[PDB]
Amino acid sequence: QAEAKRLEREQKLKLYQSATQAVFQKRQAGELDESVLELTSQILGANPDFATLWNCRREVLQHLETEKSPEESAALVKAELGFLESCLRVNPKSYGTWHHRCWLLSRLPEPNWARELELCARFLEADERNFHCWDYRRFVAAQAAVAPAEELAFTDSLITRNFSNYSSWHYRSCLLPQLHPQPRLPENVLLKELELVQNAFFTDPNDQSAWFYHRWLLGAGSGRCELSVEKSTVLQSELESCKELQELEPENKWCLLTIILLMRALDPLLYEKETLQYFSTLKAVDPMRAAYLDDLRSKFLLENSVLKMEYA
Amino acid sequence: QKDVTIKSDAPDTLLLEKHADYIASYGSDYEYCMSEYLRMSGVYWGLTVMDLMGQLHRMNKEEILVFIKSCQHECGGVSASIGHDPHLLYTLSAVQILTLYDSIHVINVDKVVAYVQSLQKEDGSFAGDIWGEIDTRFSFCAVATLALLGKLDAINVEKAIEFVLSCMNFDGGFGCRPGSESHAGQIYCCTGFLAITSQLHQVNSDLLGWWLCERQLPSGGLNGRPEKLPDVCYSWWVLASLKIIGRLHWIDREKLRSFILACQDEETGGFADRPGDMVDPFHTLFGIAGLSLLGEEQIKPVSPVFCMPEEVLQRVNVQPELVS
Numbered sequence: 001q002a003e004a005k006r007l008e009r010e011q012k013l014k015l016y017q018s019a020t021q022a023v024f025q026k027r028q029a030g031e032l033d034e035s036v037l038e039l040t041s042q043i044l045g046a047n048p049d050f051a052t053l054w055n056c057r058r059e060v061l062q063h064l065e066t067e068k069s070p071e072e073s074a075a076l077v078k079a080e081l082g083f084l085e086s087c088l089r090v091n092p093k094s095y096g097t098w099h100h101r102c103w104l105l106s107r108l109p110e111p112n113w114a115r116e117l118e119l120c121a122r123f124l125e126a127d128e129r130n131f132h133c134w135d136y137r138r139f140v141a142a143q144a145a146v147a148p149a150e151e152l153a154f155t156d157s158l159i160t161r162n163f164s165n166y167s168s169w170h171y172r173s174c175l176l177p178q179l180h181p182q183p184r185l186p187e188n189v190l191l192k193e194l195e196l197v198q199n200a201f202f203t204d205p206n207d208q209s210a211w212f213y214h215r216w217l218l219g220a221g222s223g224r225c226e227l228s229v230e231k232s233t234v235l236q237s238e239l240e241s242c243k244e245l246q247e248l249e250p251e252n253k254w255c256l257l258t259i260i261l262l263m264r265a266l267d268p269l270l271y272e273k274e275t276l277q278y279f280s281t282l283k284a285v286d287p288m289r290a291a292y293l294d295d296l297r298s299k300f301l302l303e304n305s306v307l308k309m310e311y312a
Numbered sequence: 313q314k315d316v317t318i319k320s321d322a323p324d325t326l327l328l329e330k331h332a333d334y335i336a337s338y339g340s341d342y343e344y345c346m347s348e349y350l351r352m353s354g355v356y357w358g359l360t361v362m363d364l365m366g367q368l369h370r371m372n373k374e375e376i377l378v379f380i381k382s383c384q385h386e387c388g389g390v391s392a393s394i395g396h397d398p399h400l401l402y403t404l405s406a407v408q409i410l411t412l413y414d415s416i417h418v419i420n421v422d423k424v425v426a427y428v429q430s431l432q433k434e435d436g437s438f439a440g441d442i443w444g445e446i447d448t449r450f451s452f453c454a455v456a457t458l459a460l461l462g463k464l465d466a467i468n469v470e471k472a473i474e475f476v477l478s479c480m481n482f483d484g485g486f487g488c489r490p491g492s493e494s495h496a497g498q499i500y501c502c503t504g505f506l507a508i509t510s511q512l513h514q515v516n517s518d519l520l521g522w523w524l525c526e527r528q529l530p531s532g533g534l535n536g537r538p539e540k541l542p543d544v545c546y547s548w549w550v551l552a553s554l555k556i557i558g559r560l561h562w563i564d565r566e567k568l569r570s571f572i573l574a575c576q577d578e579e580t581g582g583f584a585d586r587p588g589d590m591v592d593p594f595h596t597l598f599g600i601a602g603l604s605l606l607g608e609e610q611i612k613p614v615s616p617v618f619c620m621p622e623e624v625l626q627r628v629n630v631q632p633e634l635v636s
């Protein structure tokens with residue numbers, strides 16, 4: 001396994017070089033036909049970021065569709081889908097491959113989106129963080145007028161089935177606003193979200209994605225002066241639950257930050273001393289964020305001062 | 313949790329002269345031919361990094377100017393290589409190269425402008441080429457390109473702004489298109505876009521800044537989004553973004569520096585994505601560009617928006633105001 005592997009590369013390069021040459025010869029000639037499909041097939045599987053070759057595939061299919069029957073064009077499309085699927089198995093994180101699938105489906109008369117949604121569920125089982133796949137999923141969702149609630153139900157199962165949830169939570173942050181479209185979440189939805197994100201971060205307290213989404217939820221409401229007895233009580237209950245969690249995992253910085261954020265949400269002034277205690281522990285546990293933590297602390301001290309001078 | 317652990321032996325010193333040899337020799341080979349498709353950007357990376365090390369003269373100005381003219385198509389857009397199709401990415405790379413060389417009229421500037429203009433949509437987004445892929449990456453290519461040519465006014469700026477901001481997310485970051493998850497690369501494109509269009513006030517600097525500084529892993533290197541291995545070039549996408557929004561002091565400078573240096577190859581030269589891996593000119597540019605932003609003295613100051621030396625941009629008078 002010495003000269004063998006790196007020898008045949010001089011061969012495998014030779015094929016790519018000749019096929020690539022051939023493709024351009026053929027394209028300069030005006031020969032928009034199956035031969036280009038067959039040659040490009042051989043290059044795009046190994047090298048899907050080779051954008052110009054996706055363009056030829058397009059120029060070929062667009063042209064062919066002019067001088068072939070409905071039924072011969074139908075077959076070409078279906079074969080193009082199978083080819084696309086096989087390229088995705090080899091390389092699922094290439095812009096070109098996904099864009100070409102979107103281009104293909106965008107122009108079909110009767111596209112089968114259900115199948116494409118499932119294609120998405122299959123690739124998100126493989127890699128739940130594949131952003132090409134999530135992006136393509138939203139495109140399919142829109143094209144088939146899928147309803148926010150369907151997609152919200154999809155994100156729920158995904159969240160509980162496993163970790164690797166930053167993409168799912170992100171998707172929920174867009175779906176929820178659509179479910180209650182204001183030109184800013186309602187408290188009942190917010191409370192269900194707090195409960196859901198709360199379970200996540202006690203289940204797996206080192207998974208940052210829950211804590212980020214939670215920090216967002218903490219600001220998405222209506223203010224500390226308008227705290228319902230229920231939200232005051234739930235927020236208080238989260239505070240304690242993070243203190244418990246902090247005993248189990250004293251090296252967990254996300255829970256330390258969240259304790260600071262919760263006290264802010266509840267009553268900046270009543271918790272001023274605890275806020276300062278917590279910045280010291282937190283900076284001790286997460287020293288790389290020292291600078292960030294002092295700036296956040298200065299912002300919060302300023303906030304506090306403004307609140308104290310509003311005293312009549 | 314997912315990180316590299318820097319081997320205790322790994323490089324702790326800047327090997328400038330080696331890198332200048334690495335790039336100077338690059339393209340005299342398997343990998344080279346397989347990336348014909350990004351050649352214009354490859355030349356941009358190599359030239360830019362040489363110029364940051366004060367070594368641009370050791371490259372072929374005259375030969376690259378002819379290559380650039382031959383890569384302009386009749387619709388005005390520039391391709392990555394001769395016979396390849398035009399695209400906003402390579403039109404940007406070309407104009408960056410002509411700006412490094414003060415040779416902008418090597419190409420038909422009016423036709424580039426008309427090409428960028430033709431790619432804008434009703435909603436203000438930019439397609440990357442005639443084939444219609446929409447990405448905030450291209451919003452940045454369009455405006456970066458036009459800014460360098462003094463022709464920003466040629467596109468619908470307000471609608472372009474509106475599209476980008478409609479890609480701002482719950483976490484302060486930005487994605488490909490509306491609804492897309494935040495990622496470092498698009499955040500660099502978007503913050504750079506806002507820098508150019510004078511709209512940094514619409515960024516939530518403390519929230520995004522926090523997201524960007526949590527990218528720094530215990531090893532000191534930055535990843536591009538949560539739960540991913542760190543990597544020298546995010547270390548540039550993230551850092552640049554922080555500089556643009558005024559929060560570069562929110563990452564641990566020294567730990568980052570040690571990561572970047574540890575990404576060098578003492579033998580071949582150049583930098584790799586992570587310690588010990590195979591180098592390339594892309595990462596070589598971005599590791600050098602990162603060190604520059606981190607205050608390293610033997611490299612020129614790099615613009616965090618255009619990723620070119622500040623003196624080139626001073627010299628053409630397009631230096632957007634950053635947050636602080």
Ligand SMILES: COc1ccc(S(=O)(=O)N2Cc3cc(-c4ccc(C=O)o4)ccc3N(Cc3cncn3C)C[C@H]2Cc2ccc(O)cc2)cc1
Binds near residue numbers: 354401594
């Ligand atoms: C090695 O496999 C790849 C995968 C994607 C690409 S890419 O063309 O779509 N592009 C730029 C990119 C280039 C390189 C590279 C190899 C050789 C050279 C010298 O000319 O540069 C390597 C990677 C790369 N990527 C992928 C990547 C980088 N770090 C982590 N990854 C997964 C980025 C990609 C997107 C891009 C970025 C900037 C730009 O101006 C154009 C495209 C290239 C190689």
Ligand SMILES: [Ca+2]
Binds near residue numbers: 373
């Ligand atoms: Ca020279």
Ligand SMILES: [Zn+2]
Binds near residue numbers: 546
């Ligand atoms: Zn990289």
